[PDB]
Subunit: 144 residues, 8 copies
């Protein structure tokens, strides 16, 4: 086990700034601070925000960025905002599914409400883009 | 104060400073934004009419505004206490109070509202929120 | 006066000054806006033909105009008193009086109007209002 | 002369002067607008071919034209007296006479006309008017 | 001198002069417009290839052409006397003769025609005309 | 005027003389720069006429296709129509012989006609008039 | 003869033999070999190879269709799909490389759909698609 | 090293030289393309971000890349040995291994995959391949 500044939802701008340096994206440090990107905004970043508001011109560079961010979201501490422990429920299906925790929690979802979620809600509201991931989370939510 | 519907332009000016958006004070006052207009601000108005170019800055602004909508005093315009009905489902649902009352809705009329009206008229964009408010309203 | 349908350009000019929109006086007289045109003003005419560029400023304008439409004298054109029928249902619904009477509608013909007609012909944009006016019309 | 269908370009020119639209006399004359073309004038033709840029000014024009169309002499072209049948439902409906007469319609053929035809062929844009004319035509 | 299908360029040139369209004489001869092309002229061909920019002027042009098509001699190409079948329904329906004959249609084939064919192939744009011609054809 | 009516076999020289016979000698040079032979002439589209051959006017194109349609009606298709689809089309309407090359270029013949669809007649064979498509379609099924 | 096996040199000689020596330089800068020639699309012809005229492209594909019809596919058509397609209609043998490039053969042909023949194998004519399919189903 | 998924930028640089695409080394290095990104390269990324404008050159590139993907070492990332399951149906199908493995798929989950998912998520564009993989996966 380890000690880590790991609670991404609680991150302020300084934590995001250090993280960009840690992943080799120090080129965008000034851009992330002028936009005042904190933990909550980082977890809700869209490609449009990355491209237009943060200036990440290359689609490959954006793929690299989101590849790093997805890695960190998978191993993030969500305890400050996940009272139902939605993270460990997603992890029980697949460790890779922990990345969706903040998306589900930001919509006010929890274990008790999962059985009524739809595919459109998982895509538009929670931002689960991969249909394979949506389908497995969906069928698991309805089988309870 | 917290009775946002009754806010005048001066209160909106004070609130923008408290949330770190003092750069946009002059533009909000040139547009004469009061409590009612602040509660009905759309992304297009923020971007074009108020000059908030960045979509991230707009996300920050609406994140602050959504917090205040959750803990606002709506007593001056909410005769049926729609706010505590929304809060009984989820505290975050109180933010939709002004949207629901501006359409003339109240507890007596809620069971007949549609998903389409909740999205186009009341401005509830998240489908999880629309669907939950919808099912709860019909169980009346 | 209070009879907005009967207003001439001079009354519209005085009304714009009284509501703090004297900035748009010259534009409203160039377009020769009288009472009938004011009550049928669309957002497109406001923006393009009258030069009200800001969507927030237009929202303020229609908020004032909605108030005066709610408390207007329609005696010269509302023989069936559709205004007080709409007002008895919901105070804000009285603003729609001129939209319905300009289409030749009245109490006797109201029950056969559709939601499409209320939106396209009479200009009732809020779907909640359209549904309530319609449902009440059928209960006659 | 009150028989608009029989109007020549000179009559249209005099009529524009009587309604305060003499500014557009020269445009109407180079476009050779006579009575028949005036009664079939569309908004797009007004805007592009006649140069009436403002939507409010176009609304005033059609407001005058609709008034004249309601109290017009159709004896030269209305073999079935469709005008007084339309007027018997609502005086406002005489304005549609030339639209129906231009399509070769008459009292005998009204019962088989559709709402799509009244809108696309005859140019009756208001759905409330279309619905009343249809229900009355099919019920005679 | 009314057998439009047989017209050469010289006949079209004089007709344009007779109807006050001498402005477009040279354009019609550079395009080598003869009787057959004139009877099949589209609005797009008028606007783009013949330079008739104004939509009102094109409406005026087609108003003259439609009048002439109504009183034309089609004997050289109408074996089935489709003109008098259309004329027995309505004198104005004779204008559609060349549209029906150019598609290889005749009385024997009419009962099998659809509305889409009358619109797209034969060029009967008015739905009231299409619907009457259609129902009469099926009652054979 | 002198010409083999077997249009499918035409070479570039035949197309050149044919363009002159119909008064389109202005477009001869463009037709030879594009190397239009009998097969290409019978498959010319409005797009090719406008862009590749430079016939800007839609009326001039209508005039051209009016000339071309007449020759297509009275052409010799014997070199490529083993099933004699031409006289089958002619039995419905003489003007329907114009569609012969369109039908044979798609590999159609009498034996396959009963299974052809409306979409195939429009997209593949190029029969644009719906009245013609509908009559040819119903007639093929009556076999 | 074995078009699938052609290298750039064979394509260069073929362009000269069909009178398209004007496009040798563009075909050589794009390094068109046999496999690319058999999969050439009109978009590639126009944009990447510079054949601006749609009529010239139609002429080119008319020559290419000729050679695809009479090509030796032995190096890549183990199921001899070519002579099966040609036996239905000579016009159909040109499609051989399109079907074998998708891993198709006689045994799997009956399982192909009309949409697949158009999108995957590139058989544009609907009349050809329908005939090849119904014959495959009667196999 | 044949294990393309574990490749670093240096391996991708060496691979581009071996396949004759050393022209694009500088662009692939400026974009920091490693093994994982190379196996997920799209047509748009090749064109816009890597500067391979010619569609034929891109077709050549993907022809080489598909070859290496078919005979690649997936032991570091293919826990279910999806590669040899795909290869047993058709050797060409090993090329899809990383597409399915990147979506968290394995042998146990294949029977529930849809054609839409194979195309949108895993990037299997040929419908014939999609149909064969599905039918075989469901026959388990």
């Amino acid at each position: 086990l380890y000690f880590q500044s790991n609670a991404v939802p609680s991150w302020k701008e300084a934590e995001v700034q250090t993280w960009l340096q840690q992943i080799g994206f120090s080129k965008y440090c000034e851009s992330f601070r002028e936009q005042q990107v904190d933990g909550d905004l980082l977890l809700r970043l869209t490609e449009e925000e990355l491209q237009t508001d943060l200036g990440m011109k290359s689609g490959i560079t954006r793929k690299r960025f989101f590849r790093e961010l997805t890695e960190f979201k998978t191993f993030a501490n969500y305890s400050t905002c996940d009272r139902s422990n939605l993270a460990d429920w997603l992890g029980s299906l697949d460790p890779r599914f922990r990345q969706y925790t903040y998306g589900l929690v930001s919509c006010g979802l929890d274990r008790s409400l999962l059985h009524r979620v739809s595919e459109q809600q998982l895509l538009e509201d929670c931002g689960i883009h991969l249909g394979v991931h949506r389908a497995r989370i969906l069928t698991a939510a309805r089988e309870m």
